[PDB]
Amino acid sequence: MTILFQLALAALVILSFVMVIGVPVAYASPQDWDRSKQLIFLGSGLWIALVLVVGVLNFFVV
Amino acid sequence: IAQLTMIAMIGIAGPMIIFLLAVRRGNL
Amino acid sequence: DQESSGFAWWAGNARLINLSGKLLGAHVAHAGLIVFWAGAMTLFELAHFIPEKPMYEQGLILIPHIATLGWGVGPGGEVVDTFPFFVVGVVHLISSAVLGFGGVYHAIRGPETLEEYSSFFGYDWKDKNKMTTILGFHLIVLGIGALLLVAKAMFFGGLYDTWAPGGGDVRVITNPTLDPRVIFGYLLKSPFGGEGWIVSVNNLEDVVGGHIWIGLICIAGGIWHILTTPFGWARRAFIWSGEAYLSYSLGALSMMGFIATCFVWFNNTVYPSEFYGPTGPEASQAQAMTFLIRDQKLGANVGSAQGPTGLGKYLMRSPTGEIIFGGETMRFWDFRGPWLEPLRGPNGLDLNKIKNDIQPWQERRAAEYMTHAPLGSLNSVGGVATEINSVNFVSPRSWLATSHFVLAFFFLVGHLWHAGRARAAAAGFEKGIDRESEPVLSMPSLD
Amino acid sequence: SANLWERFCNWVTSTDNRLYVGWFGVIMIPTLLAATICFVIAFIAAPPVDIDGIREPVSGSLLYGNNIITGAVVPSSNAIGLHFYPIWEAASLDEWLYNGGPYQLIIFHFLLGASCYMGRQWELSYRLGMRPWICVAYSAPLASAFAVFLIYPIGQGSFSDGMPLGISGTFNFMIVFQAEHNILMHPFHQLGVAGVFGGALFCAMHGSLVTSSLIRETTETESANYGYKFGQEEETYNIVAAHGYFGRLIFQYASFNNSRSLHFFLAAWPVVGVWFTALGISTMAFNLNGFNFNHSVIDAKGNVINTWADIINRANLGMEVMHERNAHNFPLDLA
Amino acid sequence: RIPLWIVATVAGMGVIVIVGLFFYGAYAGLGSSL
Amino acid sequence: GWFDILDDWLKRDRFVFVGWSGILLFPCAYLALGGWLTGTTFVTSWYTHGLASSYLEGCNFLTVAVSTPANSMGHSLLLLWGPEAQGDFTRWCQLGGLWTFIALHGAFGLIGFMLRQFEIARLVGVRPYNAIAFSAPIAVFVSVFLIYPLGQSSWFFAPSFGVAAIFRFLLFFQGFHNWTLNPFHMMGVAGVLGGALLCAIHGATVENTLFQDGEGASTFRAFNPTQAEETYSMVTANRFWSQIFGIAFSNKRWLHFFMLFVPVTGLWMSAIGVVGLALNLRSYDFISQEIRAAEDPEFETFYTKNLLLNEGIRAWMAPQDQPHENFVFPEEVLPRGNAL
Amino acid sequence: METLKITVYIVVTFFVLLFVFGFLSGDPARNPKRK
Amino acid sequence: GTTGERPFSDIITSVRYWVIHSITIPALFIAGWLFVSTGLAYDVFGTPRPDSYYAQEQRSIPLVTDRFEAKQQVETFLEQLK
Amino acid sequence: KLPEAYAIFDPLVDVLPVIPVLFLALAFVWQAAVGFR
Ligand code: CLA
Ligand code: CLA
Ligand code: CLA
Ligand code: CLA
Ligand code: CLA
Ligand code: CLA
Ligand SMILES: CC1=C(/C=C/C(C)=C/C=C/C(C)=C/C=C/C=C(C)/C=C/C=C(C)/C=C/C2=C(C)CCCC2(C)C)C(C)(C)CCC1
Ligand SMILES: CC1=C(/C=C/C(C)=C/C=C/C(C)=C/C=C/C=C(C)/C=C/C=C(C)/C=C/C2=C(C)CCCC2(C)C)C(C)(C)CCC1
Ligand SMILES: CC1=C(\C=C/C(C)=C/C=C/C(C)=C/C=C/C=C(C)/C=C/C=C(C)/C=C/C2=C(C)CCCC2(C)C)C(C)(C)CCC1
Ligand SMILES: [Ca+2]
Ligand SMILES: [Cl-]
Ligand SMILES: [Fe+2]
């Protein structure tokens, strides 16, 4: 659970890092954001779940 | 001890999200 | 879409005056920055926060804000549970990502204008109906917010009351002052010495009570604007343009920035000296207390003690006769505080209570606040400009007051700037005098 | 009559008045007149004032032994503090003059009027179809008067600590300020002198450059000023010859060629600098003072190695230790 | 050919770093007070 | 002729104009700035003032300085090869040789620089009102950094080159000379303050009385670099100030000369006052005031108050500010108010 | 002394009313062009 | 509006410049660094090391008291392990 | 301090507050890249 918590929490960080850089260049260059509308959606969706994971999982470590 | 590792990445991140745009040329 | 053929680069954001869509992105991305700071800073504060140590000695300005709302604190401002601090911090920081998302989205992906992609959200600056309506929306949103405070205080836990009967403690307010004569009375109060206007609030009943009035009044005005338009005079008086509306809100914030500066500097109630530092007067009052306490223990009769000027070393009279502390502290005889009040009588400081009702907790309280006056340097060296390096400290009351005065002022400058431009933009000469039709050349010589 | 009130508003707003009495003027003119009249009478004939509230009257008027340089209008008593003290708050005028009554009457009326004076500098500009922001430049000297007459007393908790209305009295305000706040070691102040020095510098710069690059239209024994007529079409100086010179003094790209970019800089620099110096006094009104490098650099054993910052502190103590002789009863000066 | 905006932003950060190093030294070096 | 060929080369229009003046300017100007930047980081003031004055010792940008020589030196030029240093460089630094270095070099650099103004103006064929103006800064440097200490005991009492080291120079003149009470100084500030007003008010006047010569809001582009019509309405400017202030300019040629006169004249007056302080001929007191203050213990003005401040400054500062005097002031002899 | 207070108050009210009712009387109109 | 010199913009942009200055600029930096870190600077300018302001017991200042025999007097100040 | 678990992220949170400033800076990077239009 503890490591499982540090996994989710840390992964939530790297994803956000990828997301923060991703979304900009996505909407910017109109070379797509229709194939990236798939990528972005999966990242956004995943992000929320991760937050909820770390959320509940928090009351189990600390 | 040395969280300068953090700043560095988040610091070069800024110019990166527009540098990649100078490569893919568009919407600046 | 927008470049040099609109405004200059250093005036870039003015190219968005008529781009509702992108102009929304700015506001949503900006609002994220505010939530981001609030969140990221709280965690920064907590990460450095030391429980068994005064908050004002740790450079905190956000955790003491949470403390006031009755969260993680108890008797005498003792920090019990740091979890609420952690929560408030992390939740915000998360919400900043949500807001930042929409902000970035509306600014580089979504519709560059709103009028067509949705007539409800799209707007026209000169549309007095849409403007009063959008204003009506926010007037409600703020109104509910005012009641969100009322709720926390009366139902969800309470607030930190320094004036607590048994001594400073979290108390549930279950009797808000709803008497309009009392509430709105504050507005009719002087802003000078003694009568302190809004900052003179000294009990949570009025605070909670007043917020009930504001909460209702705000929403009431919120509905009014939804279902109406500006009158006649209202239209023949104001300037109706994107910049003009901005100027009006700029001067508004400026005024509130000044009021906030005096609040954090003077008020004792909504800014507890337990979480923040002791107020300026409070500190000077404490020194008189401290040395009145000391010397009296040495066998000095404070009541009849004669100072160099022959005025009263320890105790003297106010211009209206009240018994007050002596010395330069004669200017702060308007100070009121939990530690000092039990010594006060019907005519001011009672010589009998002073003589034998001084409590130990009061003595060390006076010593504490005396040695933590809001005096310091920019590089954070507590004390007078002539002090020696050792005590790294600057009262939070000092940080907040100075920072918000600078902001308030510059916003008054911003007001004048944007109000002056709007008047010239409207009438139509904000870009120079017409070479041909030069107005002055058509007016008689006064010589 | 087209309508009395309608005519009244037309007269007030009229741009055909020798002096533009604006709507702000309706407030300015009376307030400035009360301030000036009270001042003049005070400066000449006012009796001594117990400024520090310690029953130690300070005479600052001509008739009471002062000259122009020493004379001043003494700030209200420290016994009054931030209390409002109008004439109708005194048992008599004798009492009113003793507690520094005139001072409040002046500073309040002045600050009010000086604010509307800024308000009028917009109005006339509006009535004449010219751009505003002239008043914005005047916001800098006004914000200083505000900081010096109102903000600092509020912060310190008494109007007795506001700057006196006089030459030597202004000197006291400074010297003491330096002691209690170490203002010379404050960034905002330093920005102030920078704007002030730079201002005078640039004022001489522009002044000289222009007057040196004037087109010849005058005789050898005739004033060079007459080579200009009020209401000209073309320019009276070769801005292109001016730029050519100054461009060679330093180096081309470090020289202005745009008169509009020139005059903006001419206006921006001092206004911004004074804005900070005003914010400096307003910031140090809440005791956020200048840098404290006292006993900073110490040697390997722990001995204190002095700097110029320490020599400054010694001068500061002397001010502190001697100021307001009989006003202090306790060790720390928290007021 | 190296894009000007990159030259500035790199030399820019480079200045903030060295200058920020100076401000750190204000709390550690001989210029401290400890 | 080699001369005219030497001339040819020097007066060639480069990026950085050299000229005949440059032969004097650039060498001194560089050594002066360089000497400062050197001492600022490396050289100490321990053997001269008992002070740390460099980054190497821990001083920051504010507290660093190139301190004056010892009082023992007197008005010695302190040559590297002089009787004091005796060719030694390290000793030279420790005896505050860098001060006379910066001073004398900078002095000639200011000479070269005004000469540059004169030479360039002549070439461009413009009037030398830029050289006339620059005389005020010269007078100040000369009066303060040279004439003043030449009237005192030694270079030691000249202003040391540094931020804080100048602040003490201010406080000193207050405590010792009562410099603020000097009529010449007052004219000084009136010019600088009045000059900083002219600078502000004129620029703002111009920027807000401009004609519309473009269709953009940022009116900066809308300017004609090649003369022609006035870019701003002088006539409108006139009527404005004539109604808000009552008085107004109406002759650009006078307005600009006035902008020259005010700050230059002020700096010159302040110079004269300093020249008087060298012989200590200060404006310290008002005899009529002191005489009454002596007989009458209830007479108090803001003038008398200030002198007490001076007494404190002198007493508490002199010991560590004048080491060469071996001052010893017992606690009991130190002038103090009550409590403090 | 209580009288002086009344007089002043009246006086100040006068000018203050003149000010508010002043800008209210269609002030944006009063200008060279667009109104 | 132009003179002989090669436009800065071009030079600061040229790859050749950086090929040069990626070597030169850090070199000077490391050199200045060594200048201090090796304590050489202390000797070039006679600047006291943290352990060289006073003698162990002495609390007096080594003030130079006469111009001509100053150099000699200074050397004598270094003698007492100062 | 930060709850025992998150302690690993203590150094990370130490930098977070300054981030907003970077955005103000970033806007200048962009304008420089787009050659100040
Ligand atoms: C609610 C607040 C608010 C809002 C929405 C606006 C909005 C606007 N203002 Mg504005 N303004 C404000 C407050 C505000 N202002 C205040 C308080 C002042 C007084 C100083 C001004 C003074 C002002 C001027 C003088 C001008 C505007 C202009 C504009 C317009 C173009 C925006 C622009 O120029 O961006 C460009 C933004 C920048 C160039 C950034 C400036 C950076 C600032 C000066 C530095 C801040 C220091 C910072 C805290 C330190 C950071 C450290 C650093 C090392 C990272 C736009 C409509 C311009 C315009 O066209 O007028 C209509 C214009 O000329 N405003
Ligand atoms: C609060 C700060 C702020 C905000 C929100 C905006 C917002 C905006 N500005 Mg702007 N601006 C600002 C400050 C700001 N400005 C300052 C200080 C200056 C002076 C330097 C300017 C100067 C300026 C000019 C000169 C112009 C704008 C324009 C614009 C608009 C279009 C942006 C654009 O061209 O996209 C381009 C976007 C990119 C090149 C990519 C940038 C990367 C994104 C935006 C940032 C990503 C944030 C974060 C790291 C990612 C998080 C993702 C996560 C949520 C998953 C937009 C509404 C333009 C306009 O008028 O619109 C038509 C325009 O011409 N601005
Ligand atoms: C405006 C509100 C505000 C207030 C009242 C405070 C107050 C405080 N902060 Mg804080 N902070 C703020 C905003 C604020 N902060 C923001 C927006 C950020 C994000 C960058 C931070 C980031 C931050 C960190 C990371 C830390 C603090 C800390 C502190 C505390 C110590 C203060 C200190 O040493 O600062 C001294 C700072 C200065 C002297 C800098 C002043 C800078 C001025 C404003 C620049 C003005 C120049 C001007 C803009 C030039 C423009 C002109 C040009 C256009 C011509 C104090 C309680 C510290 C703490 O809690 O430790 C105890 C700490 O570690 N803060
Ligand atoms: C300032 C806030 C704000 C405003 C005014 C708008 C306005 C708009 N957005 Mg938008 N947006 C915002 C924030 C905002 N957004 C944020 C923060 C995000 C990030 C998640 C987005 C993401 C987003 C996307 C992805 C899209 C829009 C679109 C749109 C447009 C179509 C309307 C729509 O989608 O609503 C439809 C939804 C509703 C009418 C109901 C929403 C109600 C929610 C679920 C509850 C909100 C609760 C609230 C916080 C509390 C208020 C209650 C209180 C009074 C008691 C419209 C102009 C669309 C667009 O561009 O089309 C033109 C679009 O595709 N937005
Ligand atoms: C911040 C929120 C907000 C904003 C921006 C507005 C904006 C507006 N309201 Mg409004 N309103 C609000 C909240 C708000 N309202 C609330 C909460 C209510 C419920 C009480 C109302 C009830 C309301 C009514 C009933 C009316 C308006 C009207 C108006 C319009 C004209 C206002 C005007 O000309 O005032 C200018 C004010 C004056 C000329 C009077 C000046 C005298 C002031 C009040 C005293 C001096 C102020 C002083 C400096 C401050 C000291 C504090 C004082 C207590 C001592 C304007 C669009 C009018 C309109 O057009 O209807 C659509 C109108 O008739 N409002
Ligand atoms: C032309 C530029 C210039 C000028 C005017 C000066 C001026 C000065 N420098 Mg200087 N300097 C310069 C460039 C310049 N420097 C450069 C480029 C360097 C770097 C190498 C230095 C390095 C330097 C140092 C290291 C020192 C000075 C010092 C001085 C000062 C005293 C020097 C002296 O006694 O002059 C002597 C004057 C002359 C030699 C001129 C003689 C010219 C005649 C015509 C030639 C005759 C020679 C002939 C043999 C005589 C025969 C007579 C017979 C009876 C024997 C003086 C203010 C000293 C100082 O500041 O002391 C505090 C000092 O120590 N300088
Ligand atoms: C990571 C992470 C995070 C964060 C994120 C973010 C939010 C980011 C951002 C970032 C950013 C936002 C960045 C930015 C940056 C910027 C910069 C770094 C800038 C710089 C600039 C400069 C350097 C400048 C330059 C110049 C000059 C100097 C001159 C003029 C020109 C120019 C402008 C060019 C989170 C929270 C998730 C968590 C943890 C992890
Ligand atoms: C002494 C001598 C000499 C000389 C030498 C020299 C000449 C040297 C030089 C030196 C030098 C020449 C040095 C330099 C230095 C510089 C520096 C050290 C700088 C720094 C800077 C900075 C730090 C910056 C900062 C800033 C600013 C100011 C702006 C804003 C921002 C910033 C922050 C960037 C000789 C041998 C001849 C002889 C003997 C004596
Ligand atoms: C428009 C535009 C702009 C602006 C932009 C902006 C303003 C943006 C914003 C953005 C934003 C507003 C963002 C936000 C973000 C946030 C985030 C991303 C979050 C994160 C979170 C997390 C990650 C979680 C968690 C945690 C905890 C709970 C504790 C431990 C640690 C951590 C942190 C992990 C600019 C100027 C540039 C340019 C122009 C255009
Ligand atoms: Ca940490
Ligand atoms: Cl005094
Ligand atoms: Fe001009």
Closest CA to F63 of E33, C385, D309: D309
Range of the domain at F231: 22-340
Q: Alpha-carbon distance D83 to D76, whole Å?
A: 10
Check whether C3 is labelled as a binding-site residue.
no
> Is the distance from CB of C382 to CB of C204 less than 8 angstroms?
no
* Ligand 5: nearest atom to the Cα of C143: 17
User: SS3 for D73?
Assistant: strand
> Is the distance from CB of C290 to CB of C366 less than 8 angstroms?
yes
Q: Alpha-carbon distance D252 to F105, whole Å?
A: 26
Residue F246: how many CB atoms within 10 A of its CB?
10
Long-range (24+ apart) CB contacts under 8 A made by D62-70 are: D65/F289, D65/F292, D65/F299, D65/F301, D66/F301, D67/F286, D68/D167, D69/D167, D69/D168, D69/F181, D69/F286, D69/F303, D70/D166, D70/D167, D70/D168, D70/F286, D70/F289, D70/F301, D70/F302, D70/F303
Rounded to the nearest 5°, which phi and psi values hold at C315?
A: -125, 140
Kindly report the CATH number assigned to the domain that includes residue E28. Answer: 6.10.250.2070
Please return the burial class of E1, using the count of CB atoms within 10 Å of its CB with bins 0-12, 13-18 and 19+: exposed
> Is the distance from CB of I16 to CB of C90 less than 8 angstroms?
no
Which token pair is G14?
């006068």
Mutate to test the pocket of ligand 8, among F26, F33, F37 (most ligand atoms within 8 A of CB): F37
Which token pair is F143?
């009066």
What DSSP designation does I9 have?
A: G
Q: Alpha-carbon distance F214 to F222, whole Å?
A: 5
What DSSP designation does H5 have?
A: S
Long-range (24+ apart) CB contacts under 8 A made by C222-228 are: C222/C136, C222/C137, C222/C138, C222/C139, C222/C140, C222/C141, C222/C143, C223/C136, C223/C140, C224/C136, C225/C132, C225/C133, C225/C135, C225/C136, C225/C139, C226/C132, C226/C133, C226/C136, C226/C137, C228/C132
> Is the distance from CB of C308 to CB of D330 less than 8 angstroms?
no
With CB atoms and an 8 Å threshold, state whether F42 touches H70: no
Superfamily of domain A1-62: Photosystem II PsbZ, reaction centre (1.10.287.740)
D contacts of E32 (beta carbons < 8 Å): 296
Rg (CA), chain D: 26
Q: Which ligand has its closest atom nearest to the C-alpha of E10?
A: 7
Range of the domain at E13: 1-34
Q: Alpha-carbon distance F301 to D71, whole Å?
A: 8
| CATH architecture classification, H6-82 | Up-down Bundle (1.20)
Q: Alpha-carbon distance D9 to G20, whole Å?
A: 12
Query: E18 touching H, CB under 8 A?
Result: no
With CB atoms and an 8 Å threshold, state whether H45 touches F93: yes
The partner residues of F232 in beta bridges, in order of sequence, read F210
What DSSP designation does D92 have?
A: -
CB of C221 closer than 6 angstroms to any ligand 5 atom = yes
DSSP string covering C348-366: EE-HHHHHH---HHHHHHH
Would you say residue F234 lies in a domain? yes
With CB atoms and an 8 Å threshold, state whether C265 touches D15: no
Q: F59 Cβ partners below 8 Å, 6+ apart?
A: D297, D307, E31, F52, F53, F65
Count of domains in chain F? 1
Q: Alpha-carbon distance C307 to C304, whole Å?
A: 10
Q: Going by DSSP bridges, is the β-strand pair C344-345/C348-349 parallel, antiparallel, or unpaired? A: antiparallel
Q: Which residues of F are annotated as a binding site for chlorophyll a?
A: 105, 185
Instruction: Fill in the amino acid letter for F237.
Output: A
Query: What are the domain boundaries of chain A?
Result: 1-62
Using alpha carbons only, what angle is made at residue D189 by residues D184 and D193, rounded to the nearest 5 degrees?
A: 100
> Is the distance from CB of D305 to CB of F44 less than 8 angstroms?
no
Rg (CA), chain A: 14
Q: Which ligand has its closest atom nearest to the C-alpha of I15?
A: 3
CB of F82 closer than 6 angstroms to any ligand 6 atom = no
Among chain G residues, CA nearest to C239 = G28
What DSSP designation does C390 have?
A: T
Closest CA to F43 of D308, H44, H45, D305: H45
B contacts of E3 (beta carbons < 8 Å): 22
DSSP string covering C106-144: HHHTS-S-STTT-TTT---TT-HHHHHHHHHHHHHHHHH
Neighbours of ion ligand 10 (CB under 5 A): I 10, 14
Least Cα separation, residue D254 to chain H (angstroms): 13
Q: Alpha-carbon distance C393 to C132, whole Å?
A: 47
Nearest to D260 among F198, F223, F252 (CB): F223
Cited resolution, angstroms: 5.7
Positive or negative: CA dihedral F24, F25, F31, F32: positive
Query: I33 touching C, CB under 8 A?
Result: no
Count of domains in chain E? 1
Q: Going by DSSP bridges, is the β-strand pair D288-289/C376-377 parallel, antiparallel, or unpaired? A: parallel
**HEC letters along chain F:** CHHHHHHHHHCCCCCCCCHHHHHHHHHHHHHHHHHHHHHHHCCCEHHHHCECCCHHHCCCCCCCCECCCCCCCCCCCCCCCCCCCCCCHHHHHHCCHHHHHHHHHHHHHHHHHHHHHHHHHHHHCCCCHHHHHCHHHHHHHHHHHHHHHHHCCCHHHCCCECHHHHHHHHHHHHHHHCHHHCHHHHHHHHHHHHHHHHHHHHHHHHHCCEECCCCCCCCCCCCCCCCCECCECHHHHHHHHHHHCCCCCCCHHHHHHHHHHHHHHHHHHHHHHHHHHHCCCCCCCCHHHHHHHHHCCCCCCHHHHHHHHHHHHHHHHHHHHCHHHCCCCCHHHCCCCCCC
> Is the distance from CB of D160 to CB of F231 less than 8 angstroms?
no
Q: C341 Cβ partners below 8 Å, 6+ apart?
A: none
Closest CA to D330 of A30, C215, E7, C307: C307
* Ligand 8: nearest atom to the Cα of F35: 1
> Is the distance from CB of D50 to CB of D149 less than 8 angstroms?
no
Instruction: Fill in the amino acid letter for C430.
Output: E
> Is the distance from CB of D235 to CB of F230 less than 8 angstroms?
yes
Please return the burial class of F314, using the count of CB atoms within 10 Å of its CB with bins 0-12, 13-18 and 19+: middle
CATH 2.60.40.10 fits D4-181, yes or no: no
Positive or negative: CA dihedral C176, C181, C187, C188: negative
Closest CA to C438 of D13, G35, G28, F238: F238
* Ligand 4: nearest atom to the Cα of C28: 1
Would you say residue F288 lies in a domain? yes
Q: Please, how many CA atoms are within 13 Å of residue D30, restricted to the half-sphere of its CB?
A: 13
Packing angle, helices G2-24 and D25-45, rounded to 10:
150
Query: What are the domain boundaries of chain H?
Result: 6-82
DSSP string covering D120-175: HHHHHHHHTT--S-HHHHTHHHHHHHHIIIIIHHHHHT-GGGSPPEEHHHHHHHHH
Using alpha carbons only, what angle is made at residue F206 by residues F200 and F208, rounded to the nearest 5 degrees?
A: 100
Look up tokens 């108090």; give the residue.
Answer: F300
User: SS3 for I1?
Assistant: coil
Which token pair is C289?
């207390």
What DSSP designation does D234 have?
A: B
